Every structure is written in structure tokens, then in C-alpha cells.
Amino acid sequence: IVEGSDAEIGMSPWQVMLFRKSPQELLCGASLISDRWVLTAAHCLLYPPWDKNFTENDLLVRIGKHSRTRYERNIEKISMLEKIYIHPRYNWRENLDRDIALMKLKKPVAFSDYIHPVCLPDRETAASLLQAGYKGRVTGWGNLKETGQPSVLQVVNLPIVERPVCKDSTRIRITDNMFCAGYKPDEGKRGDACEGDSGGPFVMKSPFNNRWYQMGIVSWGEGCDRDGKYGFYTHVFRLKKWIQKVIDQFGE
Amino acid sequence: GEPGAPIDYDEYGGGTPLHEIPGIR
Amino acid sequence: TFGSGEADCGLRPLFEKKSLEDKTERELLESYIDGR
Numbered sequence: 001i002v003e004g005s006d007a008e009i010g011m012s013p014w015q016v017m018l019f020r021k022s023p024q025e026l027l028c029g030a031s032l033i034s035d036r037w038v039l040t041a042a043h044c045l046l047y048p049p050w051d052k053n054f055t056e057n058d059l060l061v062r063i064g065k066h067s068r069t070r071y072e073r074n075i076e077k078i079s080m081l082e083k084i085y086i087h088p089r090y091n092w093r094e095n096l097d098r099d100i101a102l103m104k105l106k107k108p109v110a111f112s113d114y115i116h117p118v119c120l121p122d123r124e125t126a127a128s129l130l131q132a133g134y135k136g137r138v139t140g141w142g143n144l145k146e147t148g149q150p151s152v153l154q155v156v157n158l159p160i161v162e163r164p165v166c167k168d169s170t171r172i173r174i175t176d177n178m179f180c181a182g183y184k185p186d187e188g189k190r191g192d193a194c195e196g197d198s199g200g201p202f203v204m205k206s207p208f209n210n211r212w213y214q215m216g217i218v219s220w221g222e223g224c225d226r227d228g229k230y231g232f233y234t235h236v237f238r239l240k241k242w243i244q245k246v247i248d249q250f251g252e
Numbered sequence: 253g254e255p256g257a258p259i260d261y262d263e264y265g266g267g268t269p270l271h272e273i274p275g276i277r
Numbered sequence: 278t279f280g281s282g283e284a285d286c287g288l289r290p291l292f293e294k295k296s297l298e299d300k301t302e303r304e305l306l307e308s309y310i311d312g313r
């Protein structure tokens with residue numbers, strides 16, 4: 001996260017760290033959506049152009065964390081993956097269309113002050129909040145600058161950007177399964193996701209019921225915090241019927 | 253106040269690859 | 278069915294459940310109030 005700040009303790013209790021077993025390295029962010037289900041970006045698990053192609057046993061997840069590196073005694077919990085589900089129409093060859101994946105934990109994780117699931121948006125929540133200029137919040141342990149790793153989880157608040165401005169900012173084909181967020185050059189403020197933040201959540205707090213909702217997944221960007229560029233995010237609501245199909249068919 | 257993303261659902265029924273863009277992440 | 282998800286989702290133990298605000302959530306709320 002570029003131009004953010006340290007998260008507060010307990011600020012993002014749905015935050016999940018995706019950790020590669022061998023060689024050991026932080027792969028991506030992710031989010032907890034129930035005691036058994038973790039949501040991430042498909043490209044964190046499958047992206048052949050960068051030689052990424054992970055199965056359930058290649059990875060583990062760490063939940064409840066704040067420090068990037070320190071073992072957090074009686075706070076963090078490690079979990080194994082029983083199954084990975086990548087969107088069957090995820091477009092890794094081109095533009096990361098449908099950049100979404102679910103991971104089923106082998107054992108349910110116990111909730112705590114530091115571990116708690118985020119909500120997925122209903123239709124009214126999505127309509128009321130997915131508006132240009134409305135701010136969401138991005139969290140992760142990714143790089144602090146484009147060219148530099150944080151000691152603790154970082155947080156930044158960023159406004160959703162009008163779709164034509166998103167499209168003008170990039171040579172990539174932007175689909176209805178993506179939105180972009182970030183400050184414009186004239187706005188002064190800065191901030192972006194960066195390498196290592198992929199797969200983490202873009203969340204918004206409903207002023208109607210006080211709950212945090214996951215509206216986006218950190219998907220891709222051209223650099224980090226560049227003037228005239230914006231971070232792109234998976235449009236979670238638009239893919240929610242797939243999420244619910246996976247949980248209806250394979251959840252318990 | 254303008255929609256940032258459409259309120260509908262992805263259903264069944266191409267350009268530059270992301271990896272070709274300098275600085276892509 | 279998963280449906281709405283956890284009945285308790287999105288309410289943080291150390292914030293909403295204690296009636297405590299985090300350091301920047303006000304910035305989000307203010308951005309959800311429209312102009313004229």
C-alpha cells in the first residue's frame with residue numbers, strides 16, 4: 001500500500017495473508033467471508049504469464065495478523081486449504097476479467113477480537129455505495145513504493161472513479177467486472193495498492209446498517225500511485241451469484 | 253453520485269494482455 | 278444457503294461492537310454524503 005498508514009489493531013479482522021509454502025513468501029492478500037471460506041483474486045493462484053499456478057497444498061493462510069513477519073502468539077491462526085475454486089471464465093490471457101477465486105479451509109477458523117468475517121453486498125447496498133467519489137478502504141502488506149515492505153498491515157482510503165475516466169487512463173480493455181479507484185492528479189491526495197496487495201479487500205462501511213461490505217478485490221494496476229493511473233478492482237457484487245453457487249454446491 | 257460499476261450480474265454469452273504493460277502489477 | 282453470509286458479518290469486535298470508531302472511517306462516511 002502506497003501513501004497509507006499503519007492499520008489500527010483490530011481494524012480489518014477479515015484480513016487474510018496468503019503465504020507460499022516453498023519457497024516461503026507472502027503471495028497475496030485475501031479476506032475471510034465465513035468460518036470456512038476465504039476470498040481472493042484468481043491471479044494470485046493462476047497467472048501463467050508470471051509462472052504462477054498454485055494448488056491447495058502449495059499454500060497456507062494466516063488469519064488475524066497485524067505484523068507482516070512476527071509470530072503473533074494467541075492472536076494469529078494458520079489454516080490449510082481443502083479446495084481452491086477459480087472462476088471458470090477468469091481471463092488470464094488478456095485483462096484479468098473475473099479476477100476472483102474462493103478457497104475452502106480444511107477446518108473452520110475460530111472467530112475472535114482479531115478474526116471476523118466481512119459482509120458481501122446485497123443489491124441495495126451495492127447500488128447505494130458504488131458511486132463515483134464514494135471512498136472505500138484497501139488493506140494489505142504489499143510494497144510501500146513502486147520501486148520497501150511494511151512492518152505491519154497498511155490501510156488507505158480511496159475514492160471510486162467514474163468509468164470513462166478509468167477507461168481513458170489505461171490501454172487495457174475494462175469490463176463490467178472491474179472498477180477503478182484512486183485520486184486524480186488535481187485532487188492532491190495520493191494512495192494506491194501495490195505489489196503484494198493483490199487479492200486483498202476493498203471495503204465500504206454502510207451508513208444504513210453500520211456493517212463493512214467487501215465491494216472489491218485488489219486486481220491490477222499500472223505501477224503504484226502514478227499520477228493519472230488508477231488501481232483496478234474486481235466488482236464483487238457482479239460476481240456474487242458465482243460466489244453463492246460455489247458455497248451452495250461445495251460449502252457446509 | 254454517478255455509478256462506478258453496474259448493478260447487475262455477470263452472465264454467460266479482445267485487447268492487449270496486461271503483462272505487456274510496463275510497470276504492471 | 279450462504280445468502281447474506283454471517284448474520285454477524287462486518288461488525289468488528291474492537292470497533293462497532295464496542296461503539297468505538299476507527300481513526301479514518303469518518304472520511305468514508307463523509308464521502309457518502311452527496312453535494313448540492
Ligand SMILES: *[C@@H]1O[C@H](CO)[C@@H](O)[C@H](O)[C@H]1NC(C)=O
Nearest residue numbers: 046047048052053054055092
Ligand atoms: C496449472 O497446472 C496444472 C498442473 O500442472 C496443469 O494441468 C494446468 O494446465 C495449469 N494451468 C494453466 C492455465 O497453465
Ligand code: NA
Nearest residue numbers: 225226227229
Ligand atoms: Na494515481
